[PDB]
């Protein structure tokens, strides 16, 4: 069976969930085979080669659709589920609280959220800590607009948003706290990224990074072989990197580690499951919302298939071996 | 059975090798049970707690005996065995060559060897690189004397030895290369140690560290429980720390990592096996050598039992799971 053939049936909704999940799990299984080495000697050689290679490098969905698919604050990162019955809205809030705890946020601090998305964390910190000034930075005008509208509705006076490609942003401004929640995976050059972040810190600042990871090895999110129809469908341009849980420890030229955690992958699995189920529940509404801006029922079905498959695939990835393969890494740093 | 009882039979040579190896393997087995956590979340919590705890802290055998037990240069660190038939003398040289390769030694450099022991590496570099100046640093007068005698016999003019407790040594001198071969395991405060080493480097220097490790977790070399007669017999004062293979990545306040390797534990296992077998072969001579300085056959038997048991135990430790538990970690750093 060719890619063309599988992609044919997928787009037509002719692959049932059972088969789809099975096919994607197999693809992730091959990545694990690729990544695990027989000895720690070989594992470190593999991992350091990856790390060295990084050092050589360098239409938007309507907000109504996003609201029908994601949780209340449209968080687009792994959330944290205390209970079986925890809702996605509760899991968003719990995840925001965990970041505030681990990044040691205190009232009165200046806070920068890099790649802030729809601004759930910016709005959380602004509401919880009235004397903080909170700045989100995003490369999306639509996201900036959404955040400023929400801050207005919430009567928040302590929020601003920088519209910038972070890789190009130049400023003399420093911040007490810099937060990077699942943004670093999108970064082309990571030695240069951490260096830039360090110039926006003082000796009193902390930097908190959260990134999807594998516990043992790093990889680009790209086709494992010629049979892999999934990876390139999800990221057809690519430029998503899955660092190992310890990869950023090798990027301490300009910052120094203070603490290090991981969150088991079942939290991410439950996040993507909640998105998939909500999209499914709101399927008719979603198709209605998208149609104006996409111009045909076929183009709508395509966008929806892509998002739904991303959630179905993410479920297999992060739930693999009960959350003990792909998971979320978190690190706290100070400036050199 | 009490410790007193096992120690009774051990000292009397009443425990055969088979039983001795079995008992020590069991003790290491319990350490593995202690150290491996069920989830990566818990493994990192365990490992970071250990790392944080470190940040809060702060008669000699005649040379003729050492010559009868160890290899030609009296190396007292893991060696490197290419073949089944590689001799300890060859393995010493191979290990010296590996350090020179990984620490990027070049003729003309100033080189400092911290905790240089009987000076095998100092003498190797001095002979191979005639324009290097090579300084060994040791806290032992007997070791200093041995090295200077060997340098004289070898017609080396480029060797000096500092007699100092490294934790107390103050100097303005800097070096192109600093080498630390299985010395850091003896260090009380490691943030402070790496900081001190950094003040002896310039922007052009490199630091190479080799340390015994476990691939997954860190531990002090101390009794696992009340049944453990071994750990405290080997190190009755203690102050040996077995860092995980990645522990020093968290000690980059003052230096920055460039490369990272591990060497499989079978190399160390073959090293301690060679020492044990050579001591066994030369047992009569060894007892004769020690008697003058120890003053009784009983005190001689004690010293020999301690050294032999150390080798028997080391064999079980490093050969465990074909060298994939305890092994040797190596790191290359530059100054911040
Ligand atoms: N170069 C760049 N400059 C600014 N933002 C960028 C960027 N590359 C990616 N981003 C943004 O970073 C975000 C990563 S997704 C995570 C969004 C948000 N932190 C949340 O947790 O929900 C996306 O909004 C992405 O478009
Ligand atoms: N505070 C200190 N100052 C100097 N040397 C020390 C020290 N603590 C331990 N040492 C020495 O460091 C050495 C560790 S054993 C390794 C010796 C040598 N590098 C080799 O590979 O053979 C021992 O000689 C030990 O006595």
XYZ file of C-alpha atoms in Angstrom, chain A residues 78-304:
227
model
C -0.183 19.481 27.411
C -2.501 20.007 30.407
C -2.528 18.335 33.825
C -5.289 15.909 34.867
C -5.540 15.088 38.554
C -8.533 12.725 38.193
C -10.159 10.456 35.600
C -13.075 12.889 35.523
C -11.008 16.109 35.318
C -12.375 18.254 32.469
C -10.117 19.961 29.905
C -11.057 23.349 31.444
C -9.901 22.147 34.862
C -6.758 20.607 33.367
C -5.833 23.925 31.679
C -6.108 25.749 35.009
C -4.161 23.005 36.849
C -1.405 23.208 34.223
C -1.232 27.035 34.529
C -0.943 26.646 38.312
C 1.863 24.091 37.954
C 3.846 26.505 35.739
C 3.335 29.335 38.267
C 4.562 27.051 41.090
C 7.636 25.704 39.246
C 8.638 29.047 37.694
C 8.368 30.625 41.186
C 6.037 33.434 40.066
C 5.495 36.092 42.722
C 3.248 39.143 42.722
C 5.042 42.251 41.441
C 7.304 40.506 38.905
C 7.667 41.363 35.214
C 6.797 38.238 33.217
C 7.383 37.370 29.537
C 5.576 34.455 27.883
C 7.391 33.446 24.690
C 5.121 31.999 22.010
C 2.081 32.717 24.209
C -0.508 31.265 21.791
C -4.067 32.308 22.695
C -2.696 33.714 25.979
C -4.251 31.395 28.606
C -1.129 31.560 30.798
C -0.661 35.331 30.302
C -4.284 35.873 31.393
C -3.945 33.435 34.307
C -0.886 35.180 35.751
C -2.343 38.656 35.157
C -5.526 37.746 37.057
C -3.842 35.870 39.916
C -1.049 38.409 40.447
C -2.438 41.931 40.035
C 0.919 43.648 40.585
C 2.707 41.558 37.958
C 3.133 43.065 34.537
C 2.661 40.279 32.020
C 3.769 40.437 28.382
C 2.903 37.797 25.803
C 5.034 37.470 22.653
C 3.523 35.843 19.565
C 4.150 35.941 15.821
C 0.396 35.878 15.117
C -1.652 39.082 14.747
C -4.870 37.101 15.287
C -3.519 35.765 18.584
C -2.417 39.228 19.746
C -5.899 40.561 18.942
C -7.609 37.697 20.800
C -5.507 38.186 23.928
C -6.064 41.956 24.077
C -9.802 41.457 23.663
C -9.859 38.871 26.459
C -7.818 41.121 28.758
C -10.347 43.910 28.105
C -13.334 41.672 28.905
C -11.608 40.427 32.067
C -10.839 44.005 33.267
C -7.097 43.349 33.262
C -4.822 46.361 33.061
C -1.503 44.564 33.427
C -1.249 42.769 30.055
C 0.575 43.653 26.877
C 1.425 41.651 23.756
C 4.502 41.916 21.539
C 3.883 40.916 17.911
C 7.242 39.512 16.786
C 9.100 36.561 15.363
C 11.090 35.835 18.524
C 14.158 34.848 16.475
C 14.271 38.422 15.081
C 13.043 40.401 18.119
C 15.559 42.935 19.444
C 15.009 44.679 22.775
C 16.930 46.075 25.741
C 14.038 45.201 28.084
C 14.645 42.575 30.796
C 12.119 40.494 32.784
C 12.079 38.852 36.221
C 10.511 35.729 34.699
C 10.594 34.263 31.208
C 8.279 31.352 30.376
C 8.487 29.144 27.279
C 5.629 26.618 27.113
C 6.027 24.153 24.212
C 7.557 26.849 21.969
C 11.176 25.640 21.924
C 10.139 22.602 19.813
C 9.584 25.115 16.990
C 13.043 26.658 17.294
C 15.571 26.417 14.471
C 18.709 27.266 16.478
C 18.591 26.502 20.190
C 22.047 27.643 21.325
C 21.132 30.984 19.730
C 17.627 30.958 21.233
C 18.861 30.380 24.800
C 21.560 33.024 24.232
C 18.936 35.567 23.130
C 16.708 34.756 26.132
C 19.673 35.272 28.462
C 20.101 38.867 27.215
C 16.532 39.544 28.399
C 17.346 38.395 31.948
C 19.085 39.990 34.914
C 20.962 38.236 37.727
C 17.628 37.981 39.572
C 15.615 36.464 36.684
C 14.461 32.880 36.179
C 13.674 31.092 32.899
C 11.159 28.227 32.823
C 10.945 25.942 29.768
C 8.358 23.209 29.151
C 8.780 21.017 26.046
C 7.456 17.763 24.644
C 10.191 15.155 24.917
C 11.145 11.505 24.772
C 12.703 10.313 28.018
C 15.775 8.736 26.351
C 16.540 10.207 22.914
C 15.920 13.224 20.648
C 14.439 13.245 17.143
C 13.006 15.520 14.492
C 9.318 14.977 13.892
C 9.710 13.614 10.379
C 9.052 10.412 8.430
C 10.724 7.353 9.974
C 10.662 5.584 6.583
C 8.873 5.387 3.210
C 5.852 3.733 4.882
C 5.328 6.766 7.180
C 2.359 8.760 5.847
C 1.719 10.340 9.280
C 4.687 12.498 10.271
C 4.766 14.608 7.102
C 0.972 14.880 7.001
C 0.989 16.389 10.500
C 3.985 18.659 9.866
C 4.335 18.922 6.024
C 7.028 21.598 6.300
C 8.428 20.026 9.456
C 10.485 22.136 11.890
C 9.260 20.400 15.022
C 12.064 18.927 17.169
C 11.428 16.469 20.024
C 14.350 16.916 22.420
C 15.197 14.173 24.885
C 14.222 14.867 28.514
C 17.839 15.884 29.218
C 18.793 17.560 25.914
C 18.609 21.141 27.234
C 21.178 20.323 29.905
C 23.688 20.602 27.022
C 22.564 24.160 26.243
C 23.976 25.915 29.330
C 26.411 28.296 27.607
C 24.383 31.286 28.764
C 22.003 29.994 31.478
C 22.465 27.537 34.358
C 20.045 24.832 35.477
C 18.396 25.037 38.926
C 15.732 22.312 38.649
C 14.450 19.649 36.255
C 11.206 17.637 36.101
C 9.150 15.520 33.745
C 5.378 15.046 33.612
C 4.220 11.557 32.562
C 2.829 11.366 29.002
C -0.688 10.301 30.056
C -1.388 13.981 30.887
C -0.651 14.936 27.273
C -2.604 11.869 26.072
C -5.639 12.958 28.088
C -5.244 16.484 26.689
C -5.352 15.420 23.030
C -8.170 12.959 23.816
C -10.271 15.783 25.286
C -9.642 17.953 22.178
C -10.589 15.081 19.848
C -13.784 14.291 21.763
C -14.853 17.964 21.930
C -14.194 18.441 18.202
C -16.218 15.263 17.554
C -19.084 16.539 19.743
C -19.060 19.920 17.971
C -18.361 18.500 14.506
C -21.403 20.003 12.762
C -20.827 23.460 14.262
C -17.123 23.289 13.355
C -17.856 22.502 9.699
C -20.294 25.430 9.648
C -17.736 27.826 11.195
C -14.914 26.885 8.819
C -16.850 26.929 5.525
C -16.875 30.752 4.895
C -13.106 31.110 5.234
C -12.154 27.869 3.478
C -14.555 28.145 0.556
C -15.552 24.479 0.080
C -16.843 21.495 2.086
C -13.816 19.530 0.818
C -11.323 22.068 2.175
C -13.185 22.070 5.514
C -13.097 18.262 5.691
C -9.340 18.424 5.037
C -8.595 20.863 7.869
C -10.740 18.809 10.259
